[PDB]
Design a protein around this ligand. Structure first.
Ligand SMILES: Nc1nc2c(ncn2[C@@H]2O[C@H](COP(=O)(O)OP(=O)(O)O)[C@@H](OP(=O)(O)OP(=O)(O)O)[C@H]2O)c(=O)[nH]1
Lengths: 213, 713
């Protein structure tokens, strides 16, 4: 199965080797280090995992633990904008296409957005998406509720239109537990195992598989 | 005195990054030649502008003309800078300190020193420089953070905690909004240090807890703080308390497996299948879309009918949605509970396939066939693996996943060119998919088709380290093949044929062997640069206020030469060096292939750095054995043999095989180790080879072939 957790510097060599880049390998490594050592609470990865029950591939952090996705995140640190409100930037959202249809991109983004609001009191996040892919559009506008402000024309290096998107960040709305159902939740107080010993006949019936011989 | 003025203008110019204009003034002072520091500055100027060969000459010159060892503070400083640019960090340290020893008043030299000393691992002296800088500049928080960090790195945990407490006092009222983050990090960092120091002491741990509770309002890393809090409760034996925190962590990220397993431990149910079943049924209600509540039970259920139902509920909905990774998601179960889970999933998925119409349910259809192909490939049933992937391809030939899997099958069958060719069909589906481009490059390299690999990768026309190591291994295989063609190639009218051919294959052998060594050697160069990439962060992390991340980076730095790619390059490259050592009795790397010191070459470029960093419980003892064996240090060979047995027992065939090679001075690998030491230990040799072949029977075709060609050459 797939695990979601915070990125650490121990993830960056695998991030580097997970994709071909146009920049040189040492530039990328320094770039990854700059992110993870500047905003060490903002970035997240998705990996496979094995649980307790030889051409070493460069994307394994550990046996049975392969990097399959990540979201690399930063706060605004342009000197030319030192008087603007704290905002967040998604430097990179990257999920292996083979690991599609498992909600990975959404889960990474949701952790990123919450961390941005909670750790850095970021007020908004801004971003652009190629007019080409509706999957990214659907992810940001629909699933994640980004506002589509406008369409910046010929925005990309190769001349493609971009959607300009922005999301105002509000801690109460970004709370992860808002998105667990498509709605019971843990009250963080009651006993979880309370059910097992209830004596009502309907309890005895439904909780059948918990009574041993 | 007119010269000193010119020099000083030059110095200013250099500092203003105006190198060519600075050089003009120097060329003039030198045209009039004895001038030590105009020599040094010219050196630094030439370096700044690309003239590296000349820069070195001028620098070396200035340094010869410095017999007294007493140069001017400015000259010393200039040399310090030059040495740092060329990455002679120890040299840079000597010059920078000489600058101060000769009366420099630039306090910034201490900051430059602290960086360099931290970089070479001299944290005792780095701490001295941090103290000296800090006392000159008590008003900058970054200097307090670096001093505390330097203290912690030297083991002075109480001192580090005390330094952080001091700054807290200074800042007690003057924490701007611009400063809340750094403050947050320094509070958590202090908690870290107090936490380590507390060890298992209950009273100390209780203080770490109250501190953590006091800082919480000012700490923005809630994840870090909750994890710390739970761990403290555990160490205090306050399990119910820890379980609340873990449930709090799960609620913040219900997709992180780790918190669920810690929750089990905190409830005392890690060994109770019934209670865990209850816990996960409960969590499943809170987190119905998340993996852990659904997957963890697949890991422990023993009742067949119960396990089968939960497996069905986990797998079938994924097949229905057409999830490519369905099999990957359950693979750990096939790995860890094979006998139990495998026949259950086989029936579940065959039954599901039975009820699908390819026309009305095409997505479930093809993805179910895809799952089954992986299922049977994993169990080594190749005809079935082929049939199920074929059913998917025949139905929908435009999905690249089907080609990846078809290629993997053929790769297991040992048909490397074919495997590459199939992936290359997948690639043609979308030439803009970089990920498929890269797997294709790799497959062609595995087939030793370097031209095609380079060509495919040149669509995005810089060397990646993974590419370079795959290319090295290809060259090595090509080397072995050319050598074998040369050995098998060993009247007068065709005795002109074999004559030129030998001469051709002698060339290629040297070409490939040299190219393999050159490619492998590039890997330690990458990793040394990763190490060097820490340089900026000794200061920068202090300025940014991320001391905890900085300490994680230092741990990463101390593990670089134990990383998977580095270790892979080191183990493969050893084949060559060890050989060259035995047999002993630059665009193509000929200079590397004709070394007089293969073993000192290996140790210097690969083995020493790995040896310094590797943990004893991760050491390759066979490598140590083989290495010291050729170094004449048989004492270490015994140590290696012993420490090997003390981990794997002495039943291992490799264990027996190894002991003998030292004494003289069925199980496949054991028989093999003996073989590559047949010229030193008296074996059947020919009866050993026949043994090694009889053992090959069970393994998959690829493993058979690889051994027959490149291990029993
Ligand atoms: N560093 C490291 N690497 C690991 C580990 N386990 C597996 N790998 C590698 O990841 C790739 C996937 O291996 P498998 O899932 O066993 O599948 P495969 O060999 O049949 O392709 C393989 O490299 P590959 O030959 O490049 O795979 P492929 O691209 O041909 O599929 C394998 O060697 C591990 O614990 N650590």
């Amino acid at each position: 199965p797939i695990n979601i957790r915070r990125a650490t510097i121990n993830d960056i060599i695998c991030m580097q080797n997970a994709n071909l880049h146009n920049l040189p390998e040492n530039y990328m490594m320094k770039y990854y280090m700059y992110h993870i050592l500047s905003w060490p609470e903002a970035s997240f990865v998705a990996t496979t995992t094995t649980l307790d029950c030889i051409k070493l591939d460069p994307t394994y952090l550990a046996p049975g633990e392969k990097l399959v996705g990540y979201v690399l995140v930063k706060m605004n640190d342009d000197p030319d904008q030192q008087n603007e409100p704290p905002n967040g930037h998604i430097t990179s959202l990257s999920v292996m296409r083979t690991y599609r249809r498992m909600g990975i991109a959404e889960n990474l983004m949701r952790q990123a957005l919450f961390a941005l609001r909670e750790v850095h009191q970021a007020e908004y996040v801004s971003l652009h998406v190629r007019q080409s892919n509706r999957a990214a559009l659907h992810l940001y506008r629909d699933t994640l509720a980004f506002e589509v402000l406008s369409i910046e024309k010929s925005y990309y290096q190769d001349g493609e239109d971009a959607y300009a998107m922005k999301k105002v960040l509000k801690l109460e709305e970004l709370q992860i537990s808002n998105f667990t159902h498509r709605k019971l939740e843990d009250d963080l107080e009651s006993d979880l195992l309370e059910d097992i010993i209830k004596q009502g006949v309907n309890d005895i019936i439904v909780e059948q598989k918990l009574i041993s011989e | 005195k007119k010269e000193n003025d010119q020099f000083l203008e030059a110095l200013k110019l250099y500092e203003g990054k105006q190198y060519k204009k600075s050089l003009k003034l120097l060329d003039a002072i030198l045209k009039k030649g004895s001038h030590v520091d105009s020599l040094a500055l010219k050196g630094l100027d030439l370096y700044s502008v690309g003239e590296k060969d000349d820069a070195a000459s001028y620098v070396a010159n200035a340094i010869r003309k410095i017999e007294g060892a007493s140069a001017s503070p400015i000259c010393c400083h200039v040399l310090g800078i030059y040495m740092r640019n060329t990455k002679e960090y120890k040299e840079s340290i000597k010059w920078f300190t000489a600058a101060l020893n000769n009366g420099s008043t630039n306090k910034q030299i201490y900051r430059d020193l602290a960086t360099l000393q931290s970089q070479i691992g001299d944290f005792k002296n780095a701490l001295v420089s941090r103290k000296k800088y800090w006392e000159a500049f008590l008003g900058y928080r970054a200097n307090w953070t670096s001093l505390a960090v330097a203290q912690d790195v030297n083991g002075e945990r109480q001192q580090a905690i005390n330094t952080l407490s001091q700054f807290e006092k200074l800042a007690e009222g003057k924490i701007s909004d611009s400063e809340k983050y750094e403050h947050s990090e320094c509070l958590m960092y202090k908690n870290d240090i107090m936490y380590k120091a507390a060890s298992d002491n209950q009273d100390k741990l209780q203080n770490v807890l109250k501190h953590l509770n006091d800082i919480e309002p000012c700490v923005f890393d809630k994840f870090g703080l909750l994890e710390r809090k739970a761990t403290i409760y555990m160490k205090l034996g306050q399990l119910k308390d820890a379980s609340i925190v873990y449930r709090t962590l799960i609620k913040r990220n219900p997709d992180n497996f780790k918190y669920y397993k810690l929750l089990e431990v905190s409830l005392g149910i890690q060994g109770d299948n019934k209670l865990k079943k209850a816990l996960y049924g409960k969590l499943e209600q809170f987190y119905p879309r998340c993996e852990p509540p659904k997957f963890i039970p697949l890991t422990f259920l023993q009742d067949k009918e119960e396990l089968s139902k939960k497996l069905r509920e986990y797998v079938l909905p994924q097949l229905e949605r057409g999830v490519p990774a369905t099999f990957s998601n359950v693979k750990p179960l096939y790995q860890r509970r094979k006998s139990k889970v495998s026949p259950l999933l086989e029936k579940i998925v065959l039954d599901y396939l039975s009820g699908l119409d390819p026309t009305q349910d095409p997505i479930p259809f093809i993805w179910t066939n895809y799952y089954l192909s992986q299922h049977f490939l994993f169990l080594k049933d190749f005809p079935k693996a082929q049939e199920y992937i074929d059913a998917a391809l025949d139905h929908t030939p435009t999905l690249v996943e089907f080609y990846i899997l078809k290629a993997r099958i053929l790769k297991h069958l040992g048909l490397m060119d074919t495997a590459a060719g199939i992936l290359e069909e997948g690639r043609q589906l979308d030439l803009q998919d970089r990920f498929i481009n890269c797997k294709t490059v790799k497959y062609f390299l595995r087939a030793n088709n370097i031209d095609k690999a380079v060509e495919v990768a040149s669509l995005f026309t810089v060397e990646a380290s993974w590419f370079i190591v795959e290319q090295a291994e290809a060259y090595y295989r090509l080397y072995l093949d050319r050598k074998k063609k040369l050995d098998d190639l060993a009247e007068s009218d065709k005795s002109e044929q074999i004559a030129n051919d030998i001469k051709e294959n002698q060339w290629l052998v040297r070409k490939y062997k040299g190219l393999a060594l050159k490619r492998f050697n590039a890997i330690p160069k990458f990793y040394k640069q990763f190490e060097d990439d820490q340089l900026d962060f000794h200061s920068y992390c202090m300025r940014k206020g991320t001391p905890r991340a900085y300490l994680e980076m230092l741990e990463w730095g101390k593990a670089l030469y134990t990383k998977p790619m580095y270790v892979r390059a080191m183990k493969e490259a050893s084949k060559l060096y060890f050989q060259m050592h035995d047999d002993r009795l630059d665009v193509f790397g000929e200079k590397l292939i004709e070394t007089s010191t293969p073993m000192e070459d290996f140790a210097t470029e690969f083995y020493n750095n790995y040896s310094m960093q590797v943990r004893e419980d991760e050491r390759d003892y066979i490598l140590d054995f083989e290495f010291n064996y050729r170094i004449g240090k048989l004492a270490l060979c015994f140590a290696s043999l012993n420490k090997f047995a003390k981990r794997f027992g002495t039943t291992s065939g490799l264990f027996g095989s190894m002991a003998i090679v030292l004494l003289h001075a069925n199980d496949i690998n054991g028989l093999l180790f003996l073989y590559r030491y047949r010229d030193d230990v008296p074996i059947g040799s020919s009866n050993l080879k026949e043994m090694i072949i009889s053992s090959l029977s069970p393994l998959e075709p690829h493993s058979q072939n690889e051994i027959l060609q490149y291990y029993l050459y």
